Amino acid sequence: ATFEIVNRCSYTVWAAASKGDAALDAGGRQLNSGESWTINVEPGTNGGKIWARTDCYFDDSGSGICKTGDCGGLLRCKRFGRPPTTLAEFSLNQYGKDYIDISNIKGFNVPMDFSPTTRGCRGVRCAADIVGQCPAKLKAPGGGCNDACTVFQTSEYCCTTGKCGPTEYSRFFKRLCPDAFSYVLDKPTTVTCPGSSNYRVTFCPTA
What we know:
The protein has four helices and 14 strands. By secondary structure, it is mainly beta. It has one domain: Thaumatin. Strand 2 and strand 3 form a beta hairpin. The two termini are about 25 Å apart. The PDB classes it as plant protein. The entry lists the keywords cryo2RT, synchrotron, room-temperature, protein, plant protein.
C-alpha cells in the first residue's frame, strides 16, 4: 500500500511510521512546510501507526531528541513515540478489508486528516485546536495535550481492567474531535476500506 504523508503545517515536522517492533519503510523523515513523503507499507501490516514529531534535533547519525513523539531518540523510528501524539492507525488486508482510524488515546500534538486516495470509503479528521483549548492538568510543557492515562496512571483512565467509562478528560477530546478515539473503550470510529486501498495523511489539513 502507498501512503503519501504531507506536511501542510507552517512549521517543520518529523514524520514517523512504525508497527511497534519495526520501522515502516524508512521509519522517519524531516518534512518542511509543504513537503510530501511517499512510503510503501507491506500488505497485511497489522497495527501500523503514523504520527508527527515536533521540535526535533538530530545529529549526522540520526540520533537526537523531539519534544513530542520521540521514538527512543531516533530519526528513523523502530518503536512507537512518546505521548502526546495524534495517531493515524491502520491494519491492512485483514480478511479482505483495511481498517483506519485517528486516535487521541495517546494525546494530541498536531492536527491531522487521514483519507484514502482510492475509492470505497471516507476519510477521518481531527483538526480542532486541542492544544490551545487543552485543560491545565493535561498540558505538556514541550507542547501538545496529553491524554489522562499518561498523566495520572490510574486504572480508570488507562482502562487497565477492561471496564472503564468516559471521563471529564476523554469528553474534552471527544467534544473537539468526535471522529477520533478519546479513550480505550470509546464507541469505535474505525472506517472500513476495501483491502489494498492507498492513503494520504495530511498534517495541519486546514493549513
